[PDB]
Design a protein around this ligand. Structure first.
Ligand SMILES: *C(=O)[C@H](C[C@@H]1CCNC1=O)NC(=O)[C@H](CC1CCCCC1)NC(=O)c1cc2ccccc2[nH]1
Ligand SMILES: O=C[C@H](C[C@@H]1CCNC1=O)NC(=O)[C@H](CC1CCCCC1)NC(=O)c1cc2ccccc2[nH]1
Lengths: 294, 294
């Protein structure tokens, strides 16, 4: 069992470099628009007035490069916290795509990029406190997170900042931040994070579908008793929605959702006692019910 | 610190579907040759005479589809355990590439494919027992592993089989097996695996170069004394070469390798005791020194 990312080729053909003044970062070039974080126009960083910063720019202040080719910016506008640079040329490599806003617990692939060129790809989850536990470099802003389903790329994240705890914060591709964050270098802190309970359960089901049943037991639990216990370990409350979502995996393994909840309760109480589940010595929470079935 | 795969775009455009009679798997289309496991011509599998089975085949026995378009096979050829299907057209998406054979303990990215279509990418290490702890579907054969070095794709692995323990075995792209395995259906087992010591040290350096310091101590050991410790815990012997190739990581953050070996020596007896390292609670051996520095 591997945390697998989506093949990155469709996204690679979209990454460009955007430079404004002394700042360069990455942009996403789809059709004839380049999307990048609006803070590329900052020098300024504690209290930027982006409306005032932007009206003073003209098209030639934005240097956009796709590989060796410089694209000509013919217009620009701001949509929430993303800048949209209109360019003279449509990206010939534009894939089928959509912009989607995800909820906490969702997973996606990140194409980490620097100077417009892709560096690596890895799988991420949106944490319950709306941060990402990413691996992001000095000039990684504008790198995007995405899923691919039937040749259609769903762009769900664009990178903007690193919080002082070392986790990461960013926006959807319409420029709205995930979580209570703003593009200012002001004191802001991520809420206390929690473990994604529905994902841990999905992964225990994956463990059952593959090798192992050693963590199962003879007990069941009510939903409320499970939540009362699990929250004492900083697990997210499990909702009826989550119970419904786990239905197909329950049906496939013959283990009722509340029976798997009993197993998780005991795993939290006992630990794993030198054993491993799918390859892990910790309870994994970055695989969704959807990810397991695939 | 995340396990990062190479961006897979350059390889995605080489993946095709090969069907022979009843069996479908993946092929690698480079220039005017498609490469795939020779066991695609089996039905038979318990002891094949591949030369005999191949002379019985003709070009039209091989159905090669590059997505929508069928490629016409105009020649067929075996090299060790890989079949070479000459097709009428050079792949216009052929990247700069070479065929390389890797050493146990080296890492690479796997592009898992099914029906000739890329499905996921992840980072792998070649185990000391020459197996791969992969994630491979029913029709994953022909999927490849690779590294990228400045526009050149170095192919090092093509997938052939799953051993009874659930680990995986394959060849290089010249058809030579990694490990003491053969392409026939028969009892074969992986040799007892060991842990890749130099990679564990690199991962520890990835923690000190990062932030963590709590496994560090004031002490040092000898290569001989450390190698006596490695044996009880089934760790690969640390060679004067490994120490040297780590030297660039020692030199940087002020920790001699044998200084970090003293830390690893104590870790092999104390455990973590609730503390992570980079962001994990087990000694990780799938990052090379080059993987950490890059
Ligand atoms: C190719 O697509 C598959 C990939 C396997 C399938 C499941 N997971 C994988 O990685 N390859 C096979 O199925 C081979 C078939 C060839 C092997 C070499 C000789 C000719 C046929 N079979 C196995 O990998 C296999 C069979 C088997 C039976 C019992 C225990 C383990 C086991 N592994
Ligand atoms: O790519 C550029 C970086 C990405 C960062 C850098 C290191 N790792 C990353 O993910 N973005 C940035 O550096 C912007 C700077 C800022 C954003 C808000 C509006 C004004 C400009 N981000 C920041 O993450 C940041 C600054 C900072 C200062 C003190 C403590 C934590 C901090 N984090």
């Amino acid at each position: 069992f591997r945390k697998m990312a989506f093949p990155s080729g469709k996204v690679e053909g979209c990454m460009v470099q955007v430079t404004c003044g002394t700042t360069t970062l990455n942009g996403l070039w789809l059709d004839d628009v380049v999307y990048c974080p609006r803070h590329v126009i900052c020098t300024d960083m504690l209290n930027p007035n982006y409306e005032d910063l932007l009206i003073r720019k003209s098209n030639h202040n934005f240097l956009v490069q796709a590989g060796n080719v410089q694209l000509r910016v013919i217009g620009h506008s701001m949509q929430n916290c993303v800048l949209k640079l209109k360019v003279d040329t449509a990206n010939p490599k534009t894939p089928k795509y959509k912009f989607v806003r995800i909820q906490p617990g969702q997973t996606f692939s990140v194409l980490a990029c620097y100077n417009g060129s892709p560096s690596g790809v890895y799988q991420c989850a949106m944490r319950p406190n709306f941060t990402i536990k990413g691996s992001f470099l000095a000039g990684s802003c504008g790198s995007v997170g995405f899923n691919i389903d039937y040749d259609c790329v769903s762009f769900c994240y664009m990178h903007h900042m690193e919080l002082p705890t070392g986790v990461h914060a960013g926006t959807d591709l319409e420029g709205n931040f995930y979580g209570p964050f703003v593009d200012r270098q002001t004191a802001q802190a991520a809420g206390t994070d929690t473990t994604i309970t529905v994902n841990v359960l999905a992964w225990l089901y994956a463990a059952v579908i593959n090798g192992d049943r050693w963590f199962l037991n003879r007990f069941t639990t009510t939903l409320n008793d499970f939540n009362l216990v699990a929250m004492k370990y900083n697990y997210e409350p499990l909702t009826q929605d989550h119970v419904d979502i786990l239905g197909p995996l329950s049906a496939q393994t013959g283990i009722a959702v509340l029976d798997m909840c009993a197993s998780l309760k005991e795993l939290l109480q006992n630990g794993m006692n030198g054993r491993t589940i799918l390859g892990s010595a910790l309870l994994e929470d970055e695989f969704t019910p959807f990810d397991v079935v695939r």
